[PDB]
Every structure is written in C-alpha cells, then in structure tokens.
Amino acid sequence: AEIKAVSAARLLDVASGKYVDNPLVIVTDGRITSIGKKGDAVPAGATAVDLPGVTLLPGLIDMHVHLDSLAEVGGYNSLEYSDRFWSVVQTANAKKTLEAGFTTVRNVGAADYDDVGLREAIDAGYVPGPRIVTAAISFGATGGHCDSTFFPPSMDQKNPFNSDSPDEARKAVRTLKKYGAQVIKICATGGVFSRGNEPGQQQLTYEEMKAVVDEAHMAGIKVAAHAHGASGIREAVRAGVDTIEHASLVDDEGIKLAVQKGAYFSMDIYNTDYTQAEGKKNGVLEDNLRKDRDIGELQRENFRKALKAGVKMVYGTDAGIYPHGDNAKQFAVMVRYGATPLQAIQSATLTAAEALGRSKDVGQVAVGRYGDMIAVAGDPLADVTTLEKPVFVMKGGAVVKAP
Amino acid sequence: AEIKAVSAARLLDVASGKYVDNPLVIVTDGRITSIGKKGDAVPAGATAVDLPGVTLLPGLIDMHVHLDSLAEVGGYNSLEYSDRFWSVVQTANAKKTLEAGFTTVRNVGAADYDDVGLREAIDAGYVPGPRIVTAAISFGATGGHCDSTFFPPSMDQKNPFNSDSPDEARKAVRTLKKYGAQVIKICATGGVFSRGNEPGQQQLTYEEMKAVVDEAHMAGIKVAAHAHGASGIREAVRAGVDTIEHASLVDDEGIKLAVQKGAYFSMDIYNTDYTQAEGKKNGVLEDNLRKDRDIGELQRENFRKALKAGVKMVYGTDAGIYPHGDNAKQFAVMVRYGATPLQAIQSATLTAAEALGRSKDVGQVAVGRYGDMIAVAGDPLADVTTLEKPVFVMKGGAVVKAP
Numbered sequence: 001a002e003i004k005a006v007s008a009a010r011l012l013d014v015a016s017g018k019y020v021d022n023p024l025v026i027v028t029d030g031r032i033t034s035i036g037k038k039g040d041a042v043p044a045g046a047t048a049v050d051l052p053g054v055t056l057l058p059g060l061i062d063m064h065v066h067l068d069s070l071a072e073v074g075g076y077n078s079l080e081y082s083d084r085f086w087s088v089v090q091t092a093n094a095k096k097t098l099e100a101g102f103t104t105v106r107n108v109g110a111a112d113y114d115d116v117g118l119r120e121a122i123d124a125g126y127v128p129g130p131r132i133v134t135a136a137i138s139f140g141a142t143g144g145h146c147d148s149t150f151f152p153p154s155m156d157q158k159n160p161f162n163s164d165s166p167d168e169a170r171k172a173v174r175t176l177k178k179y180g181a182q183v184i185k186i187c188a189t190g191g192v193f194s195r196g197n198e199p200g201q202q203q204l205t206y207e208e209m210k211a212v213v214d215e216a217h218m219a220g221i222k223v224a225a226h227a228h229g230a231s232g233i234r235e236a237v238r239a240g241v242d243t244i245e246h247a248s249l250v251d252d253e254g255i256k257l258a259v260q261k262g263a264y265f266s267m268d269i270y271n272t273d274y275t276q277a278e279g280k281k282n283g284v285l286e287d288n289l290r291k292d293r294d295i296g297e298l299q300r301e302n303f304r305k306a307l308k309a310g311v312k313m314v315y316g317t318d319a320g321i322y323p324h325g326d327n328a329k330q331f332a333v334m335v336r337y338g339a340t341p342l343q344a345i346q347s348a349t350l351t352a353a354e355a356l357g358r359s360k361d362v363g364q365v366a367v368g369r370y371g372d373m374i375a376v377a378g379d380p381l382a383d384v385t386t387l388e389k390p391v392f393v394m395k396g397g398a399v400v401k402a403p
Numbered sequence: 404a405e406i407k408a409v410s411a412a413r414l415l416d417v418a419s420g421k422y423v424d425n426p427l428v429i430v431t432d433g434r435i436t437s438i439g440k441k442g443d444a445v446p447a448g449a450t451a452v453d454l455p456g457v458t459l460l461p462g463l464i465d466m467h468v469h470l471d472s473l474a475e476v477g478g479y480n481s482l483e484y485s486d487r488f489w490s491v492v493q494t495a496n497a498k499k500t501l502e503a504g505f506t507t508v509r510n511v512g513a514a515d516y517d518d519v520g521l522r523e524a525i526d527a528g529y530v531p532g533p534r535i536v537t538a539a540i541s542f543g544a545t546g547g548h549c550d551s552t553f554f555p556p557s558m559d560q561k562n563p564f565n566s567d568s569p570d571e572a573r574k575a576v577r578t579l580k581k582y583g584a585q586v587i588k589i590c591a592t593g594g595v596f597s598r599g600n601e602p603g604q605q606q607l608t609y610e611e612m613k614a615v616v617d618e619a620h621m622a623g624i625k626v627a628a629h630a631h632g633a634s635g636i637r638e639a640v641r642a643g644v645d646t647i648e649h650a651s652l653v654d655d656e657g658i659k660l661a662v663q664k665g666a667y668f669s670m671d672i673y674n675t676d677y678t679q680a681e682g683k684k685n686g687v688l689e690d691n692l693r694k695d696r697d698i699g700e701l702q703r704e705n706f707r708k709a710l711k712a713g714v715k716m717v718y719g720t721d722a723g724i725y726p727h728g729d730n731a732k733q734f735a736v737m738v739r740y741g742a743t744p745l746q747a748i749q750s751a752t753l754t755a756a757e758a759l760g761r762s763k764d765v766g767q768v769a770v771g772r773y774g775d776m777i778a779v780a781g782d783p784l785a786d787v788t789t790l791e792k793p794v795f796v797m798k799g800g801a802v803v804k805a806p
C-alpha cells in the first residue's frame with residue numbers, strides 16, 4: 001500500500017472549530033486511516049511528511065467553478081478558438097485549482113461534456129486535478145441565461161438542452177445523467193453575463209423547476225439553480241432545489257423559505273472586484289459590466305443578511321469569471337460581510353461536503369475520509385487570508401505542494 | 404527577451420553528419436540566434452545552461468502520432484469512456500512525448516478536432532507539448548480503414564468525412580482545412596486495426612486521391628496517405644501524395660515511382676513488437692493481431708529494400724498503437740533493417756522537417772530555427788539507442804528536462 005504519515009504543528013477540526021496539537025495523520029491508499037500524535041507508531045513502509053510550524057486543514061471545496069472557461073477570454077474573443085481548445089485548457093485550470101488547495105470542486109456548466117471528460121481523466125490518474133462533481137451542460141429556458149444569447153437568428157445558436165416545459169426539462173435531466181451529470185445545474189433567472197435579460201427576471205416556472213428536482217432526486221442527484229432575482233430564488237427553493245447559486249437579490253421570504261427547507265446558498269461575492277477591474281479589457285460588453293455593478297454590492301449585503309438569518313452557506317466562487325487558482329480570495333470577502341473565519345472555512349469544507357452529499361468522503365480531516373489536506377502558515381481561525389497561500393497541499397495521499 | 408546560452412561537449416550537425424566540439428547555442432525568444440563555442444561572449448541577461456560531457460541534437464520529430472488515443476485501451480474498451488476523456492488525456496500524451504525529446508510531431512488522425520484544440524493550447528502556452536502539425540480527422544472510403552467498422556448497421560456509425568467521389572473528397576479537404584487541418588490524412592488501403600478488409604486492398608481510386616492532392620496543394624498543404632497494399636501505394640504516389648504511411652507491401656514499381664516523384668515513406672516498423680506482446684491484453688481482437696503478423700516482417704524487409712533503393716525516409720512511429728513517450732524505440736529497428744544511425748537520426752530531424760515543409764523552423768540546430776534540442780550521453784552516430792534516454796530536452800528555449 002501507499003502510506004504517508006503527515007505531521008504538523010496543529011490541525012483544525014472544522015466540525016468543532018478547535019485546534020488539535022501535534023497531529024500525525026496517516027493516509028493509506030488515499031484514505032485517512034489515523035489521526036494521532038507526532039511520535040506515535042507508524043505502519044511499516046510509511047513515508048514521513050513533516051510540516052513544522054504550520055496548521056493542517058481539510059482540502060478546500062469550491063462549489064461553483066467553470067474549469068473549461070478562461071477569465072481573460074470574455075465576450076466574442078472566445079470565438080477565435082476551436083472547440084477542443086477549451087477541452088484541453090481545462091486541464092491547466094484543474095491543475096491551478098488543485099495547487100491552490102482546492103481538492104474537490106463542483107463544475108456547474110461546461111461545454112459538450114468537457115467536465116465529464118476531465119473528471120474521468122483525473123480519476124483514472126492521467127492528469128492531476130480536484131475531485132470534480134460534474135454538472136455537464138447547464139440549462140434553462142429558451143432565450144434565457146443558460147442559452148446562447150449573443151447572436152442573430154440567422155446563426156440559429158441555441159443550447160440543445162433549452163427546456164420550455166416540465167416534461168422537456170425532465171428529459172434534459174435524463175439525458176444529462178445518461179452522459180455523466182452527477183448534479184444538475186439550471187438557470188432560474190436572468191443574469192450578468194448573458195444578453196437580453198436582467199438578473200431579477202425569473203426564467204423558469206415553478207412547475208418547470210419542480211419537474212427538474214423531482215427527476216434529479218429520483219436518481220439521487222442534487223440540483224443547483226442559478227438565481228439572482230427574488231422570485232426565482234423563492235420558487236426554486238419552494239420547488240426543492242438543493243443549492244441556490246448567486247442568490248443575489250434574495251428577499252425576506254426567500255431567506256425564510258431557505259432556512260425552513262434547508263436550502264444552501266452559494267454566493268460568489270468576490271468576483272465583482274475582478275470583473276470591474278479587468279472585464280472591459282477582457283472583452284466583456286458594457287451592458288454586462290453594468291449588470292455586474294447592479295448586483296455586486298447588493299449580493300454582498302444580502303450574504304450578510306442571509307448568513308445572520310441562519311441560511312446554510314457554501315463556498316462557491318464562480319472561478320472562470322475570475323482567474324482559476326485565485327479561488328481562496330473570497331474567504332476574506334465573506335468575513336468582511338459578516339462571517340467568522342471559522343464559518344468561512346466551514347463553508348468550503350464541512351458545509352460544502354454536506355451540500356454535496358459527500359460528508360463521508362471529503363470536507364473534514366477524519367478517519368475514513370479521503371486524505372485531502374492543506375497546510376497554512378499562521379492562525380486561520382484568526383486570519384482567513386492565510387488560506388490564500390497554502391504551503392502544503394495533498395490529494396488522495398499524493399503530495400501536490402510542500403515546503 | 405528570454406535568452407538561454409546552452410553549452411555541451413559536442414553538437415551533431417545532422418545535415419553534414421559531423422560533430423562540432425564545445426558548442427554554445429544561444430536561444431533568444433525561442434529562436435536560435437547563434438551557434439558558437441563555449442567561452443564565447445553572451446548577451447546581457449543570458450541564462451547559462453551547461454551540459455558537460457554530452458552531445459546536443461536537434462529536437463526529434465515523429466511524423467505519425469495519435470495523441471488522443473491510448474495504447475492500453477484497444478478494441479471495445481474505449482467505449483467505456485466519455486468523448487471528452489480523449490480530449491483531456493491527449494494533454495498527458497503530449498507531455499510524455501515532449502519529455503521523450505520529440506519537440507515536433509504530426510498528428511495523423513484524431514477525434515472531433517482534438518488535435519487542433521491541443522495545438523492551440525500548447526501554442527498559446529497553457530499546457531506543455533510538441534509543436535503539432537494537425538491532420539484533424541482522417542478519412543477515406545465508406546466502409547474503409549478510416550471509417551467506423553466494428554458496429555452493426557442498426558448503430559449507423561460512420562465517419563462524417565467518408566468520401567466516395569472525387570468531389571466529395573475535395574469537399575472533405577475544404578471542410579477539414581476550414582476547421583484547422585494543416586495537413587490532410589487519407590486512407591488509401593485497408594489495414595490492421597480496422598475490421599472487414601485486408602491491408603492489401605486498395606480503398607480509394609486514383610481519381611479520388613488525385614482530387615484530394617490537387618485541393619490540398621492549392622491551399623499549400625500536404626497529403627499523407629495510409630497505404631499498406633502495393634497498388635494503393637503506387638496510385639497514391641502517382642496522384643502526388645506527399646508522404647506514404649506504413650508503405651508495408653510496396654513493390655518495385657512503387658519504390659521506383661516514389662524515388663522519381665520524391666514521395667517520402669513513413670514506415671512504423673517498431674510497433675508490431677508491442678502489439679504482439681500486449682495487444683490481446685489491451686483488447687485487440689484476434690483477427691487484427693493476425694493482420695498485424697501478416698504485415699510486420701514484410702514491412703521491415705520492405706523498409707530495407709526501399710531505403711537501399713533511395714526512397715526518402717521519415718520517422719513515423721504510430722504512437723498510440725504503442726505507448727506515447729516510447730517514440731525513440733524505433734531508431735534501433737531502422738538500424739537493424741539497414742539504416743546507419745545517421746540516416747535514422749536524419750529521418751526524425753532533417754528529412755522530417757523537409758517533408759513537413761518546415762526546414763526553416765525545425766529539424767536542425769542552425770541559426771534562425773526554433774531552439775528545440777535534446778542532449779544524449781554517448782555517441783549517437785555509433786549507437787542510436789542513446790536517443791532512448793535523453794538527458795536534456797529544450798523546446799522554444801524552455802528547459803523541459805535537464806541533468
């Protein structure tokens with residue numbers, strides 16, 4: 001067997017919020033088999049990995065990434081590349097994401113099953129990357145945020161998964177699952193980077209969303225809904241959607257429903273900084289930069305409000321909108337908008353794994369879980385920005401980065 | 404500018420076949436700007452790369468690879484993977500190929516523009532790999548070696564580029580070029596790994612092949628033809644095809660025509676060793692292993708004969724049939740079947756670049772060419788197997804591998 005014995009100054013238990021001193025974490029064939037103390041016995045063959053002075057955390061989880069997109073290629077600039085360019089560069093993005101300490105991610109919309117292919121390649125050992133929960137292709141209403149909206153009718157550009165009835169949406173779920181979707185991503189409202197809508201406009205009916213949820217849940221998979229507008233958020237929650245992405249303009253009623261039903265919010269409150277700084281240079285049209293400004297501050301204020309009200313938060317950044325590998329920059333923003341460092345860390349570890357239905361496998365350094373860990377200098381309970389520069393990353397017992 | 408100053412014990416001039424002692428090769432922004440002597444002046448900023456005791460050669464060229472295929476996944480085993488799995492793993496194969504010292508390769512048939520995407524990603528700097536000349540999708544006759552041949556009619560599996568008239572073949576060339584083909588690959592005869600044919604069976608008419616060549620040549624691109632059978636080889640050469648792949652059962656008349664017209668032969672004489680050892684384990688059906696045995700030794704004997712007769716040889720291995728990264732194993736086989744080490748080396752450097760129409764850019768360590776080089780221990784003019792374990796690889800001035 002392949003055995004690593006990892007020691008450090010401290011380990012953060014993300015469930016209890018307490019530090020454990022002088023941990024010795026044994027990982028056997030990719031799974032944590034022991035969390036003891038430095039100086040404890042190790043099995044024969046164990047390879048020592050010693051990290052003096054630093055603090056171990058679980059591998060981090062980003063619930064909202066687009067690995068086959070590039071922040072710097074916005075707007076029509078993307079048209080210059082072949083289709084398979086994206087299928088290839090996602091490999092580099094996966095590598096950057098893992099090296100930043102993000103050992104599990106949820107890809108919530110990619111082109112032509114790119115993310116399914118990437119998952120298969122990583123899982124089989126051909127290329128390095130996070131454990132990817134793959135949504136495959138995201139969909140919603142014809143003409144909506146998940147459709148192609150930047151072209152005239154002569155070009156007849158449309159998402160083949162456009163769904164305009166509950167039964168068509170059900171069929172989309174079935175087709176996506178058939179070809180590798182492990183979670184379903186739908187567009188319940190308009191958005192920032194699409195054309196011909198506003199974020200507040202609901203785009204799927206309650207009935208349409210309910211059919212998606214009912215079908216996904218029969219197969220034991222979850223549903224994530226893109227939703228900025230208040231009514232889209234409320235109705236998605238009511239329909240049983242598992243996670244609400246963005247959740248930017250949520251109202252009191254939506255917050256209350258989310259608490260009642262146990263829906264998670266996945267709020268990408270960092271990336272507006274990047275968009276406003278670099279979007280124009282990157283090819284984003286003015287109308288879209290405008291919509292981003294319309295929702296940026298409100299989303300942050302609503303994160304604070306929803307957090308205070310008890311809505312379960314997961315860490316979702318929309319990597320791809322901003323550069324892959326910068327995924328940890330959002331922790332600080334969550335703290336600025338009300339979270340303790342512990343809550344912010346929990347959103348990308350304990351709570352994220354719960355929202356994935358993968359608590360047995362990821363999200364904590366505990367016996368039975370995958371040997372996915374990072375180490376950071378300093379005191380992450382006191383300063384969450386320490387997560388921006390991990391000194392150590394391990395995934396499935398493999399050392400990705402180390403001092 | 405990015406400047407490297409590379410010194411070594413010797414440099415092999417592949418044009419003259421002579422060693423140059425104590426070379427100092429300066430590479431500026433990826434291009435060789437000087438080949439002087441160790442101890443010579445260097446421009447300000449130059450980074451020293453010193454390789455004592457070893458011999459520099461040009462970066463090696465493999466004229467026949469399939470980067471989005473895997474040797475170990477043969478037969479129906481490939482069906483278990485998603486389409487984009489292949490689009491991703493080609494990244495790993497590209498990396499292994501570069502690390503083996505192969506800095507330029509010609510991909511002669513890939514799925515759904517995989518190779519075009521890979522080329523774009525490498526060239527833009529996202530992932531490491533060789534300079535890839537991309538054939539995109541290979542094609543020939545309906546039911547032929549380039550078609551899908553392992554499925555019943557109910558499944559209606561067919562290569563969309565199947566061409567059954569000169570004008571349809573011309574259209575295929577035009578469509579392939581439109582979407583990134585830099586060279587055209589056609590199937591002129593049956594083959595080993597397809598079903599329902601024998602290698603000796605010609606599958607495109609002279610007229611069909613002539614139309615392909617005429618069209619490709621108008622656009623200034625070349626044509627490579629898969630051809631085992633004698634008549635397919637003769638007629639492809641007569642039609643003006645630039646390189647003949649495999650060329651396994653060439654006859655006297657085909658050899659004479661190839662010399663007369665200046666056609667190159669690209670003979671993959673190594674891989675039968677791998678196929679006979681591992682093919683069955685890898686999922687290759689018995690009928691195909693049989694066809695491989697039918698052509699293996701004859702191809703080698705005909706390489707010797709064609710080489711002696713003066714046919715211009717290029718280095719083409721069919722990586723993908725055997726493991727990517729093992730590309731240098733064929734040199735020894737060429738020497739066993741008549742080549743001098745120099746001729747074998749020339750086939751993967753000087754002659755290959757000429758067959759690519761890229762003599763100004765690759766194939767030699769000379770001013771103006773890309774800074775693509777390897778270094779090997781020992782005396783490659785005396786023992787070509789030294790190329791199997793290069794100690795140094797550089798591509799576009801970037802150090803890929805070094806002592």
Ligand SMILES: CP(=O)(O)N[C@@H](CCCNC(=N)N)C(=O)O
Pocket residue numbers: 109190191192193194226246268269271272292295296299318321
């Ligand atoms: C593909 P996507 O739905 O994640 N893109 C979002 C990005 C939201 C961007 N902005 C803020 N969080 N402020 C949108 O176009 O609505």
Ligand SMILES: CP(=O)(O)N[C@@H](CCCNC(=N)N)C(=O)O
Pocket residue numbers: 512593594595596597629649671672674675695698699702721724
């Ligand atoms: C995709 P492909 O045409 O390179 N495959 C060849 C492999 C030839 C294999 N054998 C020998 N060189 N003996 C074929 O199926 O005919």
Ligand SMILES: [Zn+2]
Pocket residue numbers: 191226227245246
């Ligand atoms: Zn969204």
Ligand SMILES: [Zn+2]
Pocket residue numbers: 064065066108109318
């Ligand atoms: Zn998104």
Ligand SMILES: [Zn+2]
Pocket residue numbers: 594629630648649
């Ligand atoms: Zn062939």
Ligand SMILES: [Zn+2]
Pocket residue numbers: 467468469511512721
């Ligand atoms: Zn081939």
